[PDB]
Amino acid sequence: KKIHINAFEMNCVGHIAHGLWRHPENQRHRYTDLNYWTELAQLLEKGKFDALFLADVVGIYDVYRQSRDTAVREAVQIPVNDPLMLISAMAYVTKHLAFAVTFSTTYEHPYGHARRMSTLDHLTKGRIAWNVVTSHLPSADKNFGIKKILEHDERYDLADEYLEVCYKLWEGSWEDNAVIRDIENNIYTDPSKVHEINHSGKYFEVPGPHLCEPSPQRTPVIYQAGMSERGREFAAKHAECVFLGGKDVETLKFFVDDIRKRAKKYGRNPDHIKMFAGICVIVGKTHDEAMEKLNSFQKYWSLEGHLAHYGGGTGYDLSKYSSNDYIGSISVGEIINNMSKLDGKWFKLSVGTPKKVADEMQYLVEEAGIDGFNLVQYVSPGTFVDFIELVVPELQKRGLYRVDYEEGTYREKLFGKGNYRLPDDHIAARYRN
């Protein structure tokens, strides 16, 4: 009955709300400072947030105007630092706040990433999560020396075998009690309980065994946000937490059901999948305070930056179009106009007092059947601080948000005590013994 809330973030300057880095009270320019992050982790934990969701990109937005220039100038997801290098510091400073890091399966070998996750799972004591992602942005492909550029769908097929290898390493390589630290018999790890995974598929050939011993959750909690068809089929198959697109009951209600319907094919229990909706929040003690903030953000909302973001993301260079042209089925003019408005993103934008904001969140949850939200920033630490100071109490007063953390690993906090490792009905489990 409690709502899950993830704080959306990225190790760069311009994430979503482009142009806002100029806002006098913003701090995107501190992404290079370590203290910035630990403070954020600290603030988020104080606010009882389930976890810090870190997005990422290894490509550059060079679609709009046929150049990366706009992105660079506007700082649209460039520069970008590695998100995993942030986890330990943040983890050290917190006890419950979990960390979900975005990592593409398209470029870097799994064996290498398999160890990183295990290490983080170990160091964070089971508070690690991975937002599996296949990338698009072209620069990435060319920079990692990819010979054969794979197609959208074929990328998800590579992803499948990628998670497969990982599963095998995380779930099967080392038996539950391989490490025994038997001083009496000089046996640190029972060598009879460490095995090669002997994976051999279309994309990977991995002997194993894993270089790490069994960790708290073994397999990180699996995040998925791909909203394409293939993307949703991937979600239905692997994800424990799926981040849905949409800002209205109907839309969200559609995906939730679609992902559930798709999961039946894999004998997965729909209950073992948490649905999340995106949401940006501008609150105030009274309506005008909120408005004064939305007005203050509007002043810096850069259309040129969003144009660039849209370019890299859809593949459409709007400048090569005329306002009278038609892309989806909407005129490039409407597209460009709906892009210059603060509530034109594919996620809800709740503005107002704590009550109103909570009421709308509660409305999506109770009418769309979603399990949680992925809070989106417009200003840092503004929206996170405001939300935590005004909305959270309102949500707690109503028994919609936890008053304090549940003990255990992230998976347990998500699916209950005792459930620290993936359920029998989850694919990964096929590689356990």
According to the 3-state scheme, what is the secondary structure of 183-247? CCCCEEECHHHECCCCEECCCCEECCCCCCCCCCCCCCEEEECCCCHHHHHHHHHHCCEEEECEC
Q: For residue 85, what are the contacts with CB-CB under 8 A and spacing of at least 6? A: none
Total domain count, the chain: 1
Binding residues, as ranges, are 56, 135-136, 156, 225-228
Interatomic CA distance for residues 164 and 111, integer angstroms: 11
As a whole number of Å, the end-to-end CA separation of the chain is 35
Binding residues for FMN, as ranges, are 56, 135-136, 156, 225-228
Interatomic CA distance for residues 125 and 121, integer angstroms: 6
Q: Indicate which technique resolved this structure.
A: X-ray
Question: Angle 110-123/152-167 helices, nearest 10 degrees?
Answer: 60
Interatomic CA distance for residues 396 and 376, integer angstroms: 20
Residue numbers of the domain that contains 148: 1-433
Provide the CB-side half-sphere exposure for 73 (13 A, CA): 14
* CA distances, 325 to each of 67, 101, 313 (Å): 22, 38, 19
Are the CB atoms for 384 and 313 separated by under 8 Å? no
Interatomic CA distance for residues 61 and 71, integer angstroms: 6
Question: Based on C-alpha coordinates, what's the Rg of the chain?
Answer: 22
By DSSP bridging, strand 274-283 and strand 348-352 are parallel
Positive or negative: CA dihedral 14, 19, 21, 25: negative
Interatomic CA distance for residues 172 and 219, integer angstroms: 11
* CA distances, 190 to each of 69, 73, 176, 196 (Å): 56, 56, 11, 14
Interatomic CA distance for residues 308 and 130, integer angstroms: 27
Interatomic CA distance for residues 305 and 64, integer angstroms: 9
CATH number at residue 264: 3.20.20.30
| Residue 186 CB coordination number (10 Å) | 6
- Residue appearing with tokens 């046996």: 187
Question: What is the greatest pairwise CA distance in the chain?
Answer: 80
**What values do phi and psi take at 275, rounded to 5?**
-95, 130
Question: Angle 249-263/354-368 helices, nearest 10 degrees?
Answer: 40
